[PDB]
Design a binder for this molecule. Structure first.
Ligand SMILES: Nc1ncnc2c1ncn2[C@@H]1O[C@H](COP(=O)(O)OP(=O)(O)OP(=O)(O)O)[C@@H](O)[C@H]1O
Ligand SMILES: Nc1ncnc2c1ncn2[C@@H]1O[C@H](COP(=O)(O)OP(=O)(O)OP(=O)(O)O)[C@@H](O)[C@H]1O
Ligand SMILES: Nc1ncnc2c1ncn2[C@@H]1O[C@H](COP(=O)(O)OP(=O)(O)OP(=O)(O)O)[C@@H](O)[C@H]1O
Ligand SMILES: [Mg+2]
Ligand SMILES: [Mg+2]
Ligand SMILES: [Mg+2]
Ligand SMILES: [Mg+2]
Ligand SMILES: [Mg+2]
Ligand SMILES: [Mg+2]
Ligand SMILES: [Mg+2]
Lengths: 34, 321, 320, 321, 34, 34
DNA sequence: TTTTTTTTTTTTTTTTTT
């Protein structure tokens, strides 16, 4: 648990997480079945 | 769809494409459907350039008359998303319809959000079972999104929870302006990857408090009409299913007793006319719920019973009977 | 995020003090506020408002996030124990921060006792299930009793003096005062860390303040504004919010399907605004029944909890 | 309490003060607690003048937040009124608390009026013996008030019967409207001289007959709610202990067999929620009576026995055991 | 079922279908009774 | 016991009490464990 | 020097008796 788990500042201090989110959002769609 | 890059012909510069993308237009269909006034409102666009763009868009996108037989055989191939309940599936005639607006209205604990979650998770399964094979987009205005339900339902359908979570985009709106602005980002995102479902829960939550008094009613209705027009245009452009959630209030004027239900949805005439299909939800006994088709251009008026279990919405069991 | 981070790109300290006087204390509040309310502030221009909006949007994210990251973020959310194992099991670890929890039921059902237990337990360390923050209490019926807080803090081993000092209390005499107290609450939580807000009760004043069917719309809209402000405060500061509500017996026995003829006050606005709803009934002795009515992620079930001199707890074998 | 005469500052005229006094507001606390709408609807006051009055009232009396320790230490000094019985004092943890609403409900002949008569005398004895050192006010709706009991009780406590009778004010209501209107004169009377106790016996004596049928139920409940809210304002303003008596009704529908007692107090949810403390009375053997705490924010549920004699309410004797 | 059944690209990529539509639109009216 | 214990006039007559309350409200949070 | 045009848009429950 964290004092600021849902705080937006947590997203502001981690540009790498935002870059990963942006990369995952526009990655090509695939069938989610193994 | 037709990518906007095909417009880079006959003297159209790449800077014009950048301006159109910044203005919210991302596809050739967007240019074709846009009226003259909106194009002229874009800075750095000349009248002759606008006419050339309109001509090029009309050339690529057919806009003429088509015989009804071809339209019928085209509509016969639309993708319908299963809701996970055969009883509810029969009433919809195959499930929700892509390229159309479906509205769900009712009181609380009626399971609208559960149904939205089930549609959000079932749009990824192969279409031969009833899926859509595409990513889902979720817009939340009440802070009620819960990925645990998505994980459980994906486990029910034999789907990988990691990929199921990764294939769903989520966003939250804090005011009416932000909610309207999120559509630009949604359109930009869908222009790069294949999507099949857009859900808005709920449309009417923010407008109730953002606009105050009888004086601001006209502005609120105009903004709502603009938002629904944008949603319809987006659905026409990308051909994805659209689901919206609506709230309900009780009419204090009990002068008319013909309708035993004293509850009517929020939205006024704009919501009633804009939405294509309307479903009302009521609570039954136990975990069972009642669904009724209120307005539909093709489906007859009837009722159905479904249920909510830990794995999502489904057909009621004999134990609950 | 402190609002002082907005002191860039020609923003004057006078603008910051005007925003503070207008009730906005953090950059999140500025970001969430629409343009119309910013224009209503005296001495604010359209260009300055646009600059403020852009600066706020830069500081806090407002875009799209994948569901996996949202799930892993919510997995670390803080839940406050209620002192009863049954309640924790029913709520999956206790009350959830950042969401509105409503408790409704008839009198002598122990809602105020549960509110006191939550207020005291918000100070104990995290490893026991607390929140490690101050508590704020708004009383609309004059039923606050510090003796219960002292006794329950004695149960948990806290210092009674520190426990009393870490709890802020206020009383509202009308709807306007109740709404106005939120600005002071927001300022206090901006100046110091808080974890819990308790409102008991929401609908006490609205029953008498507004009269007749003619004033029903105004009362409902004022309640909607109050709940919107509460939700904005909750997701701005990330503190848990608990509200208590009364019940009314429905005279029309047309809906004989429901065995319980009592329904909570507030109607559709109250029902839709609250994230979670718990109904309370009286059992035998000190035992009480708690039932989850609405919850986006919890099934419908019931639990039994007892009230003793040390607060809310699990029922004992002597009561069985 | 702060007199309203202190409000005549910063352009406030005496005419405004006399109009407010004619409107029922006799103290600055009344102005502070009054909502803006009710203050504005009074004829002869402008919006700017109303805002100035509200600002002055907020300046005169605190309305902000306060730490719990200070509130606790302030509450520890609150005056509690002795009832003449050690068992009742132990059950209530000191006696009747000022500034709170106490309700006594039970069947007839249970001595509810006897406690009111005893409190009408014990409110004048010095503070060292649990008194209030203030005048008493009595509202009668059943024609039961008897000065002979007051004389006997004053003789028991050694107080002068003439002074005891002269220090108590009596009034009788004939309908709900008169009952509500009597509070207007009561506020002025308690503003002109120090009081400590208000007694209403009974609250719903007139409401049962004035409003009949299901159609008039809503109006009756709303009127009762307004009456109790006015009582709450009065108690908050003057800090006097308020005691109300209520009747009981037998529930014909014996569906809820879990309750061994088929008699419940009348008034419904409004009466239940309005009362801060509730005491149920039952008849014992001889002069003995049983008192039980039903609802209390700080007291545990328990029962006690108290006797009634010619000198008033007291502890049971060994002869009655 | 097709992923782009209602897409305008389907109509644009089939000039023969458009020619058939144009031919059928201007063909003389007849009573649809057998 | 006081005749004006809960009366609002008591707090208004003691500005030092209000200053102490405001100072206590604004002091930083600490764990209430010895 | 001349010489008017042309509507929009719904809110929102209360309350036991015997
Ligand atoms: N995991 C679960 N298992 C069983 N029932 C559940 C589960 N999660 C939620 N429910 C039930 O679903 C109902 C709530 O569903 P849902 O959140 O969709 O409500 P809604 O009527 O759409 O209201 P809202 O306006 O608050 O979104 C409640 O009856 C709740 O008990
Ligand atoms: N110190 C105490 N010890 C034991 N039980 C207590 C104590 N104080 C109160 N109670 C119990 O709690 C009951 C009232 O609790 P509480 O005030 O929290 O109820 P509530 O239903 O929320 O009431 P309200 O509607 O009046 O706010 C009492 O009737 C009693 O049974
Ligand atoms: N002078 C007296 N001396 C002794 N006992 C008395 C005297 N007067 C009354 N009583 C006792 O008190 C009883 C009536 O008391 P009281 O009027 O307070 O009852 P109650 O339950 O409040 O009545 P109600 O519902 O009619 O108001 C008598 O039946 C008797 O037992
Ligand atoms: Mg829902
Ligand atoms: Mg229609
Ligand atoms: Mg309570
Ligand atoms: Mg809900
Ligand atoms: Mg009698
Ligand atoms: Mg009597
Ligand atoms: Mg109570």
């Amino acid at each position: 648990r964290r004092k600021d788990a849902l705080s937006a500042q947590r997203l502001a201090k981690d540009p790498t997480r935002l870059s990963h989110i942006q990369y995952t959002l526009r990655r090509s769609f695939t069938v989610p079945i193994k | 769809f037709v990518p906007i890059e095909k417009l880079q012909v006959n003297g159209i510069t790449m800077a014009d494409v950048k301006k159109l993308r910044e203005s919210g237009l991302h596809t050739a269909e967007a240019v074709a459907y846009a009226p003259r006034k909106d194009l002229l409102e874009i800075k750095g666009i000349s009248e002759a350039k606008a006419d050339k763009l309109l001509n090029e868009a009309a050339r690529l996108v057919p806009m003429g008359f088509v015989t009804a037989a071809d339209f019928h055989m085209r509509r016969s191939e639309l993708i319908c998303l299963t809701t996970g309940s055969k009883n509810l599936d029969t009433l919809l005639g195959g499930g929700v319809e892509t390229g159309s607006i479906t509205e769900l209205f009712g009181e609380f604990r009626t399971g609208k959000s559960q149904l939205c979650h089930t549609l959000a998770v079932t749009c990824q399964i192969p279409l031969d079972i009833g899926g859509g094979e595409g990513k889902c987009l979720y817009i939340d205005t009440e802070g009620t999104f819960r990925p645990v339900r998505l994980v459980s339902i994906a486990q029910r359908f034999g789907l990988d929870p990691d990929d199921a979570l990764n294939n769903v985009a989520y966003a939250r709106a804090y005011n009416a302006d932000h909610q309207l602005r999120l559509l630009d980002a949604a359109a930009q995102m869908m222009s790069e990857s294949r999507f099949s479902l857009i859900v808005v829960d709920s449309v009417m939550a923010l407008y109730r408090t953002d606009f105050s008094g009888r004086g601001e009613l006209s502005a609120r209705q105009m903004h709502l009409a603009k938002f629904m027009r944008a949603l319809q245009r987006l659905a026409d452009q990308f051909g994805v299913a659209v689901v919206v959630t609506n709230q309900v209030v009780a009419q204090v004027d009990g002068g008319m007793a013909f309708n035993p239900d004293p509850k009517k949805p929020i939205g006024g005439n704009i919501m009633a006319h804009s939405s294509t299909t309307r479903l009302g939800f009521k609570k039954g006994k136990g975990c069972q719920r009642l669904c009724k088709v209120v307005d539909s251009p093709c489906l007859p008026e009837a009722e159905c019973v479904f249920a909510i279990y830990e794995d999502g919405v489904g057909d009621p069991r004999e134990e609950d009977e």
